[PDB]
Design a protein around this ligand. Structure first.
Ligand SMILES: *[C@@H]1O[C@H](CO)[C@@H](O[C@@H]2O[C@H](CO)[C@@H](O[C@H]3O[C@H](CO)[C@@H](O)[C@H](O[C@@H]4O[C@H](CO)[C@@H](O)[C@H](O)[C@@H]4O)[C@@H]3O)[C@H](O)[C@H]2NC(C)=O)[C@H](O)[C@H]1NC(C)=O
Ligand code: NAG
Ligand code: NAG
Ligand code: MAN
Ligand code: MAN
Ligand code: CA
Ligand code: CA
Ligand code: CA
Ligand code: CA
Lengths: 220, 589, 46, 210, 214
């Protein structure tokens, strides 16, 4: 006779993400040539590394001005892709479609004031477990880097990926481990006649930044 | 109540020219004139049909209205065979405002070709004249063009002068009809004038900048008024925004020093709150009070039915910065009460400023009505002391008597300010004069007022019998401000037992009659004149009525015909002043 | 090449499954991120 | 790491700058071909549905990541729940054609029907952003507003009608899904997240026992 | 660069018979490609020709950068613009063109100014948003930081859905100049600063000559 086959139950339903191709309906079409077009990108994280985008601060500006008082905290925000400061970066607009990440986030700090304005800054990483620091002297016991302005006007610091698990969530739910990865605290050590300057700050992905498990929550 | 209605000054123009759409007084430096706006009047300007003109109407002697030449030219050209402007139907004279030697008229529908593409945008324009000088003032005619700019501004839709000689100009079409308030000092308007420059920049210009798109189609600058509200002497800017707040209507008040923002708001949808505004201190506290008109307001009656009557909101300015807002409703349905609001100054010279409100489409045959409201301590007396009626019938567009009006000007030097009313629908303009107010201190004394029937003191000639008599005594004293006769003759009337077909129980001795008249002639500001006479009771057996009090009535009438002056302006007696008083007398037992 | 967690290949010829490319005559943002200056730029002490 | 701020040269730093070590990473989930190869739901018209990819909701995964590239290529796969037979017609074909059975027509087979459709545009690559001649730009003016405003949409350009793979027509199309095959992308464009009102965009994640 | 505030990074650029020297340079940014793709295609039948007289700088004014301008102030210049040179007589002569751009933006105010400009070449810019300005560095860009430079030089190829373009109905590139940090005139800074562009087309190819009413 013919070949016996057992049509199994639970198989063959449409799955919107199955590794199967549809049946052809129309054949032998040749595309117009498109080899060597400018601007090809194959991976979304290749563009997130070669192209930093601005952060967002109080008043909706990409810069933080040099304050002259007993306070020296410029920015201090949750190390979270869902943070408010990160909300307009390409790295956080691309991470909203994934549930977990891993690796390093780079922050680019470009100083803008005139040639006679001078300042010294400090960026630290407060891991989760206790409150974040409020002065630079208390934050000097963290992982920090300190730079000052000169001929070279940009400094780049890599937020280290410390965590208990290998992956962390890109969303945030409640006060919980995976959604608070600590803080990142920007201080101003000194300044000389730098009143009202701007320190524009960018952000991008590190060498080992990773982002996996696609998802579709909402709101492009 | 003191306005002359018998023979008021009438002025007319070409039919269809809208003579009376705008009116004002013109007092230079020592003759007095009248300014009437006729925005549809044909001019001799080269190839311009209905350019509109403003007429200076001679009040002295004859009723001649000589037109005023602000601009005799036609449409200037941008290039060869490319007109720059369109003065045809520009509605020049739609708004006329004068201050001493300075006359400002405007053309809200003046269109202008851009300095780029060939457009036709109604930026509006104005012409300022200072005696021999005459410049052009088009603040909306600028580089900012086309709807979102000042292209459809129609600058000059409403105008007003401040006390520091600064012009306030309104344009309801700027920035997609958000509207715009523009203020320039009269100094720079002429000083920075340039006949070859179409967009003049003024160094000291105050203006409302463009706002968010949700403020579009609000019509700021629809109407304007000036007055101080922050207590620094400088006139501030009051303007109606009738489409603001989703057609609820608003009224903005800006600082007259830096265009810094009070804000009024309406209670009813599409009632056109802000169609007209006026600022005058109504309660004598030297604080400018805000008057806002909403002619389309609907009210409910005892039958609970909606009826469009119109409404004016009287906001008294308190030193607290707050306002004491009182709402005054219209009287006739669909008459649009509150279309025009005109401060009159102290019309009756009583100590408080007065104001006039019009229902242009009211009265019999839609002629028009103007209501006169007097001010007092508590605020504005809500009851009108006078009702001015139109006297002309319709042709196509209704007479619109009261659509525009102007007051607060003593044009005849009688010490009392007058009023102009424009009825453009019939191309007429009317000047009402204010008659001099005479306050009168009338007096009446009856002594003794308790009559003893058996007293029998005063003898009576002709008979040996004596009668119970007593004294009646009346006094007059009158005085008034402004120009008025120093002699005043009155007609005094006296009646005994006024309460009584019935028998009068008292009569005058030297006449034997209950009635007595006395031609009395007192002097203005002079002493109190007082004539007395003897009245007597009837005999006890002549009447049974002994319980009813005998009322003594005094009444007086002024001779208006002989009190007239030069033109025949007859004075009037003060309102709320009793034209007659009465005392009584009792009998005992 | 794209979405596969399985490899069941095709009944049909490539000439019917897809549209065929033509040659005339990972490119940019992969060379641009790989040319990223990673090393420290100063004179590192300690 | 210091550097010239405005060189526009990509400058990466690492955790070796302060004693760490860069770990290895797997990046298969952000590959353009991998991530764009899903079915995405599209709101269908009643009968006729021109198969444009810019008809996808922009807030979706495939919608938002497609609009992150100026130019794109892909073959298309379609899933359709319809009533009656479903006809396809290639790019540039008249509407009257949707009625003829000789064109690729799939007879009704429950519950749905998935077809592999080629690339039939005259263009070497399609576009998400089309601007024939539009911007000044200089932060565009308020000049056209109110009524003229809602008409003013096209004072510029942007029209995906020309860039159409084709159309489908059934008596009643109930559900429609697109799947991009062999997706190539060029010239990346902005991609935005949800702007939070708090200091951080909190949300409700699935909650097991512990 | 140099040991002092004084600055010597010389860069010269010759397009045609027109040069341009800068002493405060950061380098040229290449966007999306270093070379060109295939000019000869199956859509012009080999009737395409290169016009070498059209490849030379032309100048244009962008905007005044004043201290009152805050973050997000844009200036959009759609390329190709209205050109009165020989490159302009190509859109009236030929129906199809293709070319890259060599864009050099200048903002001269002394090094005692603060502030920062971001000049970027954006393809197919139909609409920009306030939040999308935060990700404007996804495009070929350079910053103009008055303490360090006055010039931003950006070279960029031809992009489109077609191999040749009809520039009378399509503007593929757009030069956007954005304020990322407002200007400051501290004590010695220049009060305002004018921004100019010095653009030059590259590899211009034309095809299909139209009739002439001459
Ligand atoms: C009886 O009949 C005779 C005649 O009619 C009455 O005569 C009157 O006497 C009055 C009181 O004397 C008198 O009042 C006026 O003259 C007064 C001086 O003679 C004078 O003092 C009064 O001023 C004051 O008067 C007013 C009056 O209202 C009082 O209110 C004040 O308190 C003061 O007293 C008056 O100027 C009156 O003129 C006089 N009239 C006549 C016609 O003779 C008499 O009063 C009667 N008496 C009875 C029985 O009632
Ligand atoms: C005190 C007050 O609220 N002032 C407001 C001003 O802020 C606003 O611009 C305006 C809008 O109509 O309303 C008035
Ligand atoms: C005392 C007397 O004679 N009275 C008369 C009065 O009746 C008349 O009405 C008036 C007319 O002016 O003249 C007087
Ligand atoms: O809603 C934000 C907005 O609120 C209001 C003002 O303070 C603006 O300056 C600010 O941008
Ligand atoms: O657009 C959303 C944003 O709009 C504004 C305010 O209501 C904010 O709180 C809000 O987060
Ligand atoms: Ca004031
Ligand atoms: Ca008052
Ligand atoms: Ca009064
Ligand atoms: Ca008078």
């Amino acid at each position: 006779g013919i070949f016996p086959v057992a049509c199994s139950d639970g198989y063959g339903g449409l799955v919107t993400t199955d590794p199967k191709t549809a049946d052809p309906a129309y054949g032998k079409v040749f595309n117009p040539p498109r080899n060597m077009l400018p601007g090809r990108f194959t991976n979304f994280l290749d563009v997130a590394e070669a192209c930093p985008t601005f952060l967002r601060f109080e008043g909706d500006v990409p810069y933080v001005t040099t304050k002259t008082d007993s306070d020296r905290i410029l920015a201090q925000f949750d190390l979270s892709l869902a943070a408010k400061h990160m909300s307009n970066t390409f790295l956080a607009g691309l991470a909203q479609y994934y549930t977990q990440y891993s690796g390093t986030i780079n922050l680019h700090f470009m100083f803008t004031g005139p040639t006679d304005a001078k300042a010294r800054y400090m960026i630290a990483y407060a891991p989760p477990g206790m409150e974040p620091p409020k002065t630079p002297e208390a934050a000097a016991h963290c992982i920090h880097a300190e730079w000052d302005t000169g001929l070279n006007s940009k400094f780049t610091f890599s937020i280290p990926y410390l965590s208990a698990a290998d992956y962390a969530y890109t969303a945030s739910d409640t006060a919980e481990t995976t959604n608070v990865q600590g803080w990142v605290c920007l201080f101003q050590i000194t300044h000389g006649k730098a009143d009202g300057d701007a320190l524009v700050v960018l952000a991008s992905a590190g060498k080992d930044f990773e982002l996996r498990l696609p998802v579709d929550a909402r709101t492009q | 109540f003191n306005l002359d209605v018998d023979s008021p000054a009438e002025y007319s123009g070409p039919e269809g020219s809208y003579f009376g759409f705008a009116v004002d007084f013109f007092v230079p430096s020592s003759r007095m004139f009248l300014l009437v706006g006729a925005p549809k009047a044909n001019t001799t300007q080269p190839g311009i049909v209905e350019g509109g003109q403003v007429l200076k109407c001679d009040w002295s002697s004859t009723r001649r209205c000589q037109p005023i030449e602000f601009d005799a030219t036609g449409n200037r050209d941008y290039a060869k065979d490319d007109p720059l402007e369109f003065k045809s139907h520009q509605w020049f004279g739609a708004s006329v405002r004068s201050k001493q030697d300075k006359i400002l008229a405007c053309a809200p529908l003046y269109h202008w070709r851009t300095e780029m593409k060939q457009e036709r945008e109604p930026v509006g324009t104005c012409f300022l004249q200072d005696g021999t000088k005459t410049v052009e003032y088009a603040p909306c005619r600028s580089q900012d063009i086309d709807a979102d700019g000042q292209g459809f501004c129609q600058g000059g839709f409403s105008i007003d002068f401040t006390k520091a000689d600064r012009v306030l100009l309104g344009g309801p079409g700027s920035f997609y009809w958000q509207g715009q308030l523009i203020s320039d000092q009269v100094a720079e308007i002429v000083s920075k004038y340039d006949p070859n420059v179409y967009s003049i920049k003024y160094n000291n210009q105050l203006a409302t900048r463009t706002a968010q798109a949700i403020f579009d189609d609000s019509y700021l600058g629809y109407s304007v008024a000036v007055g101080d509200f922050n207590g620094d002497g400088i006139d501030d800017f009051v303007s109606g925004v009738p489409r603001a707040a989703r057609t609820l209507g608003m009224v903005y008040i800006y600082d007259g020093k830096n265009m810094s923002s009070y804000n009024f708001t309406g209670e009813q949808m599409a009632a056109y709150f802000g169609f007209s505004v006026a600022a005058t201190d109504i309660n004598g506290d030297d604080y400018a009070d805000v008057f806002i008109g909403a002619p389309l307001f609907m009210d409910r009656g005892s039958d609970g039915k909606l009826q469009e009557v119109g409404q004016v909101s009287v906001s008294l300015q308190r030193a607290s910065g707050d306002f004491q807002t009182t709402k005054l409703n219209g009287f006739e349905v669909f008459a649009r009460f509150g279309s025009a609001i005109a401060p009159l100054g102290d019309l009756d010279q009583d100590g408080f400023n007065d104001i006039a409100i019009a229902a242009p489409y009211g009265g019999e045959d839609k002629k028009g009505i103007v209501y006169i409201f007097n001010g007092r301590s508590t605020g504005l007396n809500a009851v009108p002391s006078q009702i001015l009626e139109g006297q002309w019938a319709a042709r196509s567009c209704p007479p619109s008597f009261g659509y525009s009006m102007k007051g607060a000007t003593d044009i005849d030097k009688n010490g009392y300010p007058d009023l102009i009313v424009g009825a453009f629908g019939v191309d007429r303009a009317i000047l009402y004069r204010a008659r001099p107010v005479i306050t009168v201190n009338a007096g009446l004394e009856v002594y003794p007022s308790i009559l003893n029937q058996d007293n029998k003191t005063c003898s009576l000639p002709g008979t040996a019998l004596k009668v119970s008599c007593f004294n009646v005594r009346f006094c007059l004293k009158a005085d008034g401000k402004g120009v008025l006769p120093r002699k005043l003759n009155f007609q005094v009337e006296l009646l005994l037992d006024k309460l009584k077909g019935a028998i009068r129980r008292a009569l005058f001795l030297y006449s034997r009659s209950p009635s007595h008249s006395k031609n009395m002639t007192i002097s203005r500001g002079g002493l109190m004149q007082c004539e007395e006479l003897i009245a007597y009771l009837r005999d006890e057996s002549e009447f049974r009525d002994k319980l009813t009090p005998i009322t003594i009535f005094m009444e007086y009438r002024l001779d208006y015909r002989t009190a007239a002056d030069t033109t025949g302006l007859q004075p009037i007696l003060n309102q709320f002043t009793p034209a007659n008083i009465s005392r009584q007398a009792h009998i005992l037992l | 090449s794209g979405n596969t967690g399985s490899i069941i290949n095709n009944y049909y010829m490539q000439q019917y499954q897809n549209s065929m490319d033509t040659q005339l005559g990972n490119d940019w943002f992969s060379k641009l991120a790989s040319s990223a200056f990673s090393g420290l730029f100063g004179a590192l002490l300690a | 790491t210091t550097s010239a701020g405005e060189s526009a040269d990509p400058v990466t730093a690492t955790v070796e700058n302060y004693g760490g070590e860069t770990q290895v990473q797997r990046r298969q989930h952000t590959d353009v071909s991998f991530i764009l190869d899903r079915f995405v739901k599209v709101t269908p018209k009643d009968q006729i549905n021109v198969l444009d990819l810019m008809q996808t909701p922009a807030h979706t995964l495939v919608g938002a990541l497609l609009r992150t590239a100026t130019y794109y290529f892909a073959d298309l796969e379609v899933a359709v729940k319809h009533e009656g037979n479903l006809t396809w017609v290639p790019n540039g074909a008249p509407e009257t054609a949707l009625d003829n059975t000789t064109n690729p027509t799939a007879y009704h087979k429950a519950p749905l029907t998935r077809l592999a459709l080629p690339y039939t545009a005259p263009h070497r690559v399609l576009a998400t952003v089309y601007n024939g001649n539009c911007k000044y730009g200089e932060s565009h003016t308020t000049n056209v507003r109110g009524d003229l405003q809602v008409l003013a949409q096209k004072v510029a350009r942007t029209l995906p009608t020309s860039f159409n793979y084709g159309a489908i027509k059934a008596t009643r199309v109930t559900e429609l899904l697109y799947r991009m095959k062999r997706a190539e992308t060029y010239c990346p464009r902005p991609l935005l997240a949800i702007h939070p009102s708090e200091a951080r965009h909190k949300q409700k994640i699935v909650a097991p026992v512990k | 660069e140099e040991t002092t505030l004084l600055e010597d990074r010389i860069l010269t650029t010759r397009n045609g018979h027109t040069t341009s020297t800068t002493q405060s340079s950061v380098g040229v940014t290449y966007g999306y490609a270093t070379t060109e793709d295939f000019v000869s295609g199956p859509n012009t039948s080999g009737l395409e020709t290169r016009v070498v007289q059209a490849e030379r700088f032309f100048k244009t004014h962008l905007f005044d950068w004043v201290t009152s301008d805050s973050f997000g102030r844009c200036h959009l210049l759609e390329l190709p613009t209205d050109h009165k040179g020989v490159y302009g007589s190509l859109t009236d002569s030929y129906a199809y063109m293709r070319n890259g751009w060599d864009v050099e933006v200048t903002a001269v105010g002394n090094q005692f100014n603060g502030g920062c400009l971001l000049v970027a070449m954006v393809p197919e810019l139909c609409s920009i948003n306030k939040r999308e300005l935060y990700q404007l560095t996804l495009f070929p860009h350079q910053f103009i930081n008055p303490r360090t430079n006055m010039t931003a030089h950006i070279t960029v190829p031809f992009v489109g859905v077609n191999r040749y373009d009809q520039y009378k109905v399509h503007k593929p590139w757009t030069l956007v100049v954005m304020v990322v940090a407002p200007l400051t005139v501290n004590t010695e800074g220049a009060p305002q600063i004018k921004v100019y562009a010095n653009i030059a087309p590259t590899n211009v190819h034309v095809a299909g000559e139209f009739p002439s009413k001459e």
